[PDB]
Nucleic acid binder design. Structure first.
Length: 64
DNA sequence: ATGAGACGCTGGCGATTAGCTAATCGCCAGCGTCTCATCTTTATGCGCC
């Protein structure tokens, strides 16, 4: 999908740390940044849909 | 006593990939014999209810 909204974007130092280039960020990042994403969720900064997309990787990733 | 519902280039090319009767004409066609007998039938020729 074509998405320019903040719900799909994330600022990083380099795009190679996302994991795979054709799917939602790899399990190495979710199981290492879950505490930081939950702490960003309690701070009312990211929305619930953003956290759900950040956590959708461990839910099954992106099927076809 | 919240967390789902909303999903692509195809058509128009080439270019493979595959496959088929039909219309025209020519060629060329197993054949050789004899014996033996056997019967017919025909042409002509001869007769009155």
């Amino acid at each position: 999908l074509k998405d320019d909204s903040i719900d799909n974007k994330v600022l990083t130092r380099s795009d190679k740390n996302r994991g795979k280039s054709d799917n939602v960020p790899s399990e190495e990042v979710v199981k290492k940044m879950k505490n930081y994403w939950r702490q960003l969720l309690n701070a009312k900064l990211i929305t619930q849909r953003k956290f759900d997309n950040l956590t959708k990787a461990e839910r099954g990733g992106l099927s076809e």
